[PDB]
């Protein structure tokens with residue numbers, strides 16, 4: 695496998711989004727993963743509707759909109775629904791709304807998703823290298839996470855109890871420190887312009903490799 699990967703260099707990553715006070719991290723993680731696939735399949739980079747998932751991938755999928763959800767069930771919703779609208783056609787309002795999906799605004803589809811084996815960082819590396827960006831859950835409950843500004847994030851108090859949905863868009867090493875390149879959804883002002891480099895191959899740090907999954911078109 696290549697020593698480093700950055701899907702932003704292949705134009706497969708849309709710009710960082712800001713979820714606001716709505717717990718839609720899972721929805722942003724899911725669309726971000728599909729956005730890369732759509733780019734690989736059609737050649738067009740398009741932001742997909744996180745709001746679409748918030749309002750429609752609900753109870754039936756075990757999700758609670760602005761109060762949390764799963765990236766995997768979000769993927770299944772897209773498969774079952776036979777589509778997902780573009781962000782432009784179904785804009786993010788940071789609040790729970792009635793489902794307003796309309797196939798005339800469909801911007802992507804999904805045929806299946808894959809959940810990687812628990813905590814295998816090498817397997818995650820392979821997926822990121824050969825498949826594309828991967829949705830993952832990380833433990834982001836620690837004060838240090840919120841205050842992260844640069845370098846490689848390592849928190850002694852992190853655990854494998856994930857609670858925040860994000861997107862791994864690459865990996866590499868910075869000054870002798872291996873890391874996973876993570877796209878967050880707290881706006882471009884968080885970390886390094888919306889991104890955070892988290893410790894890689896450090897005992898599944900913050901549970902980043904605990905529950906990885908990626909969709910396919």
Ligand SMILES: *[C@@H](N)C1(NC(=O)[C@H](CS(=O)(=O)Cc2ccccc2)N[C@@H](c2ccc(O)cc2)C(F)(F)F)CC1
Pocket residue numbers: 716717718719720756757758760761762763764765830831832856857858859860905
């Ligand atoms: C992000 N804004 C938000 N967190 C979640 O929605 C969170 C994402 S996750 O990656 O931890 C989901 C996950 C957990 C365990 C194993 C694989 C994936 N999901 C939360 C959640 C899930 C389902 C419902 O119905 C509500 C909430 C939780 F509880 F799992 F962390 C809100 C902060």
